[PDB]
């Protein structure tokens, strides 16, 4: 059939019984750096089994009056295994990702998620004269969440969490131009993306440039009758792919 | 001492010209290119990506995520109307702010077909049939299912594959149509009606929702580039 | 670039359904209107020529204008070069994430007489000088300074009445593409400024009168027109919905999605 | 584009008064609309604004209990309702349409609200 | 002397252009580079699906 | 809250008139000057430290950096007898300065 997959990376395996087809990038599979495109003169370190595996992030609860969540992508894996210990010791870095969001429900629940992966997403501050700090933009493998109201201008440095403008100033319905996949609890059960390295420099520093953002926005909210299980969690597993680093320095 | 004679049009500054110009930094070398994914060569690759259209505008849902859900429930009579909107993708405020209707606000003329993908965001046991009708202008808006069954229509049945595509055709007297509101080139109406009911088993919520997308077919065209009316400015940004 | 034509069709009754799809797979359906109804064989001569990235972007648009007064010391204008101070060009350049283009830069310099008090005023034609200081060079501090020699900085000299001056600028950037967006800090300790303002270091643009203050003050005005050529664009982006707020960042006040109508069945 | 307020009104100490600011010439549901109070012997003072597209109001910390700003998108007016009127609130109230960042470009002409017995 | 004799855009005649300057960023605009590949923004899917077949087998 | 300190100025016709208002801490060039006519119509004059608004005659000019700023009318007329405020836009809430009325000398 065309409903079952089995992804194998490193020493981990993600199986699935019903899911749609995979959405690969803007058309290209993640691969290593060439020789006519490189700019660093020292030899990279490609472990390729010690990083390219599925790291499981934390689970968030889908309530009825829930708004959305976002994870900044090369920041959520900063304390995860030998990928967070190679980001601290090396200066540069180049990764492609393989995101897999999974949320299961029975045949009596209903709802619909939008799993998108927005590159270079700047967020707008609450008070229009400042810029948000680090702790309000992204948490260490923990989901920051949107709201359904507007954050007032009384707060000094906080991220605007109005979900119908998606934090960036675009319409939330127009986010389907970025590579995306819907999780519809009628038919679908999990949605997987493959993302290559999208940046203007061949290699980039990884502690001050978050070049991807994974957004999950519920368009049709969860609803059930009285008797079904009310606790529906959402778990995201993210694996790097084809990673390499240059410029070994001290710990930072 | 070759004799020339300067024609009219000399020493003007036209803002859409194609001339050569003396370079300001001579023998500059550029930075070599890189294979960055997702190169766009034409704006008709952005308009062919579907985007959710906000049908449910009721003056207190535009400031929410409830503008995208068309509510559908289990009735007691038959033949009701789910929604309806005229098909003017640059002037109607339903199709105004989508991904298609914003590229179409830079241009003045358009031609081609428009796909309209619907998706049933309901439970796993609920069934039902909907009739997606499109009526070209000349009459009014259709009022009954007996009057909207005459135009172009397609009877959608929900099931395992949970999305149906009504492709409106290109039936028009002129080759192009105006983006702005012009009654000489009106384009028609799009409605959707209950064929049968929405039947649910016990312990299932009866109120289901429906999303709707909109894109353009592989024969869309635009012409006569203008400036957009949606952005505005009074002072300089500083 | 001719578009496709519709082929003829016939009434069918088969197990192949082109209308039904699955929109959950993130893949827009490629149906043709000859698959959901009966059609004829029309041939389209329509062209998609006026929607490429070249013809959509290669059009001149103003970005800034500054005024300066003759009869004043430190009467001279300056501008830190960035394309984020108008709204009709900032919305076109924020449809794509990364751009790469060569400019064609034009100035339209006008003049106006100030209310002087000397009798029988007569001033000859005026000459303007527009110097471009790269990031790090020497800057002037008054109208008659040593930095206006243009020993290595490029500059133009323009008398009034002639055609407007025009240069051409090649792709002057560090990386491989102009980045219109940047999500990251400048310091490695993740503080300080954040946003697109950490990438913009493009220089300054100084303007002054060459003539001296004869008998009447003359206030001028210079408008600056950009025009991108040989454009390549990568990674498209949904357009801006809210109104713009600042030059440095992407702030906004939240706005509803569309305007409102009275019902769901109304037209 | 111009903003046209109501006429000068009068109220007893303890009653409530309702002003208006009819926006005309532009699209009402896009820009926020502020309210500024000037007592006749002092300078201008800020009260609070209202987003007419989502009806989210945010007052100053001194006028949090008295004012109640509201608006309607249909007739394109913005109302301001004062409550618990004392003899401090006899001033002139302007409405301003806040353009790009912090610049109050278009102002009204202002209604004079006075309290007496 | 160069003189790349190209074609003109019309409905349903040649023209000559010569480059004069030494910098490649000082030519005319392109205006005639028509290429389309919309299969990367509408079909970003690994295992391809036929239009006539059902999507979820 | 930023305390904005600016009272009743007098100058003859056709002279150089200067007003100054001083903020509490550095507001970083975010100062706007308004003008209130004697009937009660208010309009924006200068929306930065120096940048004039479209529709304002070229008599008015501004300056200043850091904490202390100024507004300079280089030739006083009859239409420019009004009251001038200064307003910051750097810290919530937007606070206005006190008035400054102009009048003729003798
Ligand atoms: C004739 C002498 C003056 C020449 C001045 C050259 C000015 C070069 C400007 C560089 C382009 C700026 C592009 C900003 C980045 C963006 O596109 O977002």
From TrEMBL, chain A:
What protein family is recorded?
A: Belongs to the picornaviruses polyprotein family.
What is the role of the protein in this entry? Plays an essential role in the virus replication cycle by acting as a viroporin. Creates a pore in the host endoplasmic reticulum and as a consequence releases Ca2+ in the cytoplasm of infected cell. In turn, high levels of cytoplasmic calcium may trigger membrane trafficking and transport of viral ER-associated proteins to viroplasms, sites of viral genome replication.
Q: Where in the cell is it found?
A: Host cytoplasmic vesicle membrane; Host nucleus; Virion
Subunit? Homodimer. Interacts with host GBF1. Interacts (via GOLD domain) with host ACBD3 (via GOLD domain); this interaction allows the formation of a viral protein 3A/ACBD3 heterotetramer with a 2:2 stoichiometry, which will stimulate the recruitment of host PI4KB in order to synthesize PI4P at the viral RNA replication sites. homodimer.
Counting on the full-length protein, the chain here runs from 79 to 330 of 2183
User: What protein name is recorded for this chain?
Assistant: Genome polyprotein
Organism of origin: Coxsackievirus B1
Superkingdom of origin: Viruses
UniProtKB/TrEMBL annotation, chain B:
Where does this one sit in the cell?
Answer: Host cytoplasmic vesicle membrane; Host nucleus; Virion
Look up the coiled coil feature and give its residue ranges.
none
**Superkingdom of the organism of origin:** Viruses
| Protein family according to the UniProt entry | Belongs to the picornaviruses polyprotein family.
- Source organism per UniProt: Coxsackievirus B1
- High-level lineage: Viruses, Riboviria, Orthornavirae, Pisuviricota, Pisoniviricetes
Protein name per the record: Genome polyprotein
Outline the subunit composition.
Homodimer. Interacts with host GBF1. Interacts (via GOLD domain) with host ACBD3 (via GOLD domain); this interaction allows the formation of a viral protein 3A/ACBD3 heterotetramer with a 2:2 stoichiometry, which will stimulate the recruitment of host PI4KB in order to synthesize PI4P at the viral RNA replication sites. Capsid protein VP1: Interacts with capsid protein VP0, and capsid protein VP3 to form heterotrimeric protomers. Five protomers subsequently associate to form pentamers which serve as building blocks for the capsid. Interacts with capsid protein VP2, capsid protein VP3 and capsid protein VP4 following cleavage of capsid protein VP0.
Full protein segment contained here: 333 to 570 of 2182
From TrEMBL, chain C:
Cell location: Host cell; Virion
In this chain the Picornavirus capsid domain maps to 34-200
The record, for InterPro entries, names:
Picornavirus_capsid, Rhv-like, Viral_coat
Classification lineage: Viruses, Riboviria, Orthornavirae, Pisuviricota, Pisoniviricetes
UniProt keyword annotation of Disulfide bond present = no
In the record, biological process GO terms are: symbiont entry into host cell; virion attachment to host cell
Q: What is this protein called?
A: Genome polyprotein
* Gene Ontology molecular function: any one: structural molecule activity
Q: Which organism is it from?
A: Coxsackievirus B1
Query: Where primarily located?
Result: host cell
Which Pfam family, an example, fits this chain? Rhv
Q: Cellular component GO terms, alphabetically?
A: host cell; viral capsid
| Classification via Gene3D superfamilies | 2.60.120.20
**What keywords are assigned to this protein?**
Capsid protein, Host-virus interaction, Viral attachment to host cell, Virion, Virus entry into host cell
TrEMBL record, chain E:
Record localization = Host cell; Virion
Highest taxon of the source?
Viruses
- Function description: Component of immature procapsids, which is cleaved into capsid proteins VP4 and VP2 after maturation. Allows the capsid to remain inactive before the maturation step. Lies on the inner surface of the capsid shell. After binding to the host receptor, the capsid undergoes conformational changes. Capsid protein VP4 is released, Capsid protein VP1 N-terminus is externalized, and together, they shape a pore in the host membrane through which the viral genome is translocated into the host cell cytoplasm.
The family annotation for this protein states: Belongs to the picornaviruses polyprotein family.
Q: How does this polypeptide assemble, per the annotation? A: Interacts with capsid protein VP1 and capsid protein VP3 to form heterotrimeric protomers.
Q: What is this protein called?
A: Genome polyprotein
Q: Which organism is it from?
A: Coxsackievirus B1
State start and end of the fragment within the whole protein: 1 to 69 of 141
């Amino acid at each position: 059939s065309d409903r079952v997959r089995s992804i194998t990376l490193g020493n981990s395996t993600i199986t699935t019984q019903e899911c749609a087809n995979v959405v690969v990038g803007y058309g290209v599979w993640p691969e290593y750096l060439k020789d006519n495109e490189a700019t660093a003169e020292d030899q990279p370190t490609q472990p390729d089994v010690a990083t390219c595996r599925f790291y499981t992030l934390e689970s968030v609860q889908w309530m009825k009056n829930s708004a959305g969540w976002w994870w900044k992508l090369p920041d959520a894996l900063s304390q995860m295994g030998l990928f967070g210990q190679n980001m601290q010791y090396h200066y540069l870095g180049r990764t492609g990702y393989t995101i897999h969001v999974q949320c299961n429900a029975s045949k009596f629940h209903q709802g619909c998620l939008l799993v998108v992966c927005v590159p270079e997403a700047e967020m707008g501050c609450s008070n229009l004269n400042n810029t948000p700090e680090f702790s309000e933009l992204s948490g260490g493998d923990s989901a920051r969440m949107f709201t359904d109201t507007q954050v007032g201008e009384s707060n000094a440095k906080k991220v605007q969490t109005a979900v119908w403008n998606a934090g960036m100033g675009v319409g939330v319905g127009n986010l389907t131009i970025f590579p995306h996949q819907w999780i519809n609890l009628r038919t679908n059960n999990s949605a997987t993306l493959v993302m290559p390295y999208i940046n203007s420099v061949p290699m980039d520093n990884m502690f001050r440039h978050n070049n991807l953002t994974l957004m999950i926005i519920p368009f049709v909210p969860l609803n059930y009758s009285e008797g079904s299980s009310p606790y529906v969690p959402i778990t995201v597993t993210i694996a790097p792919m084809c990673a390499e680093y240059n410029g070994l320095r001290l710990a930072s | 001492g070759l004799p020339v004679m300067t024609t009219p049009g000399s020493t003007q500054f036209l803002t859409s010209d194609d001339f050569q110009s003396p370079s300001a930094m001579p023998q500059f070398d550029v930075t070599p290119e890189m294979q960055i994914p997702g190169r766009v060569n034409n704006l008709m690759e952005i308009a062919e990506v579907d985007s959710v259209v906000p049908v449910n505008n009721t003056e207190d849902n535009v400031s929410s995520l409830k503008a995208y859900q068309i509510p559908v429930q289990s009735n007691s009579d038959n033949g009701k109307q789910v929604f309806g909107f005229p098909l003017q993708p640059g002037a109607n405020n339903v199709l105004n702010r989508t991904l298609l209707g914003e590229i179409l606000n830079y241009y003045t003329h358009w031609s081609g077909s428009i796909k309209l993908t619907f998706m049933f965001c309901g439970s796993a046991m609920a069934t039902g049939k909907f009739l997606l009708a499109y009526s070209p202008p000349g009459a009014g808006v259709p009022k009954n299912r007996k009057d909207a069954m005459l135009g172009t229509h397609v009877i959608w049945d929900v099931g395992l594959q949970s999305s149906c595509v009504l492709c409106v055709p290109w039936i028009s007297q002129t080759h192009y149509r105006y983006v702005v509101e012009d009654e000489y080139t009106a384009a028609g109406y799009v409605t959707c009606w209950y064929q049968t009911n929405i039947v649910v088993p016990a312990d299932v919520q009866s109120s289901c929702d429906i999303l709707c997308f909109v894109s353009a077919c592989n024969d869309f065209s635009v012409r006569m580039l203008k400036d957009t009316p949606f952005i505005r400015q009074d002072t300089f940004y500083q | 670039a001719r578009v496709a034509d519709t082929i003829s069709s016939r009434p069918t009754n088969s197990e192949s359904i082109p209308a039904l799809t699955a929109a959950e797979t993130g893949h827009t359906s490629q149906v043709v209107p000859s698959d959901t109804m009966q059609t004829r064989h029309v041939k389209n001569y329509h062209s998609r020529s006026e929607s490429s990235i070249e013809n959509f972007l290669c059009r001149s648009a103003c970005v800034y204008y500054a005024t300066y007064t003759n009869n004043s010391k430190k009467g001279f204008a300056e501008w830190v070069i960035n394309t984020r101070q108008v709204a009709q060009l900032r919305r076109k350049l924020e449809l794509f994430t990364y751009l790469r283009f060569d400019l064609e830069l034009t100035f339209v310099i006008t003049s106006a007489q100030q209310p002087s008090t000397a009798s029988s005023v007569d001033a000859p034609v005026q000459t303007h000088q527009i110097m471009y200081v790269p990031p790090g060079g020497p800057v002037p501090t008054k109208v008659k300074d040593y930095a206006w020699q243009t020993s290595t900085n490029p500059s133009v000299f323009w008398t009034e009445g002639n055609a407007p001056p025009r240069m051409s600028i090649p792709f002057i950037s560090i990386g491989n593409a102009y980045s219109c967006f940047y999500d990251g800090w400048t310091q490695f300790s993740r503080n300080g400024v954040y946003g697109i303002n950490t990438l913009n270091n493009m220089g300054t643009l100084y303007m002054r009168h060459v003539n001296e203050a004869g008998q009447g003050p003359i206030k001028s005005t210079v408008r600056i027109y950009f025009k991108p050529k040989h454009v390549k664009a990568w990674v498209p982006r949904p357009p801006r919905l809210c109104q713009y707020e600042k030059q440095k960042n992407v702030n906004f006040s939240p706005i509803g999605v569309t305007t409102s109508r009275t019902d769901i069945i109304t037209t | 584009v111009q903003l046209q307020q109501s006429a000068a009104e009068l109220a007893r100490p303890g009653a409530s008064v309702k002003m208006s600011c009819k926006a005309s010439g532009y699209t009402f549901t896009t820009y926020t609309m502020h309210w500024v109070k000037q007592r006749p012997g002092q300078g201008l003072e800020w009260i609070g604004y209202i987003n007419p597209s989502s009806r989210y109001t945010e007052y100053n910390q001194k006028f949090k209990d008295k004012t109640t700003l509201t608006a309607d998108k249909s007739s394109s007016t913005a109302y301001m309702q004062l409550s618990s009127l004392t003899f401090e609130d006899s001033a002139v109230y302007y409405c301003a349409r806040r353009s790009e960042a912090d610049r109050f470009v278009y102002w009204g002409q202002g209604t004079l609200v006075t309290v007496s017995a | 002397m160069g003189a790349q004799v190209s074609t003109q855009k019309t409905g349903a005649i040649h023209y000559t252009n010569i480059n004069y300057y030494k910098d490649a960023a000082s030519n005319s605009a392109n205006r005639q580079d028509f290429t389309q590949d919309p299969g990367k923004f509408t079909e970003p899917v690994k295992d391809i699906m036929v239009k006539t077949m059902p999507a979820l087998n | 809250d930023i305390q904005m300190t600016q009272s009743s100025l007098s100058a003859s016709l056709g002279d150089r008139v200067t007003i100054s208002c001083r903020a509490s801490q550095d507001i970083s060039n975010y100062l706007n000057w308004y003008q209130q006519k004697p009937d009660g119509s208010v309009k924006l004059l200068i929306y930065y430290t120096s940048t004039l608004h479209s529709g304002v005659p070229s008599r008015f000019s501004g300056s200043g950096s850091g904490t202390d700023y100024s507004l300079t009318i280089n030739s006083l007329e009859q239409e420019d007898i009004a009251t001038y405020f200064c307003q910051q836009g750097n810290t919530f809430p937007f606070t206005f300065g006190g008035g400054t009325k102009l009048e003729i000398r003798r």
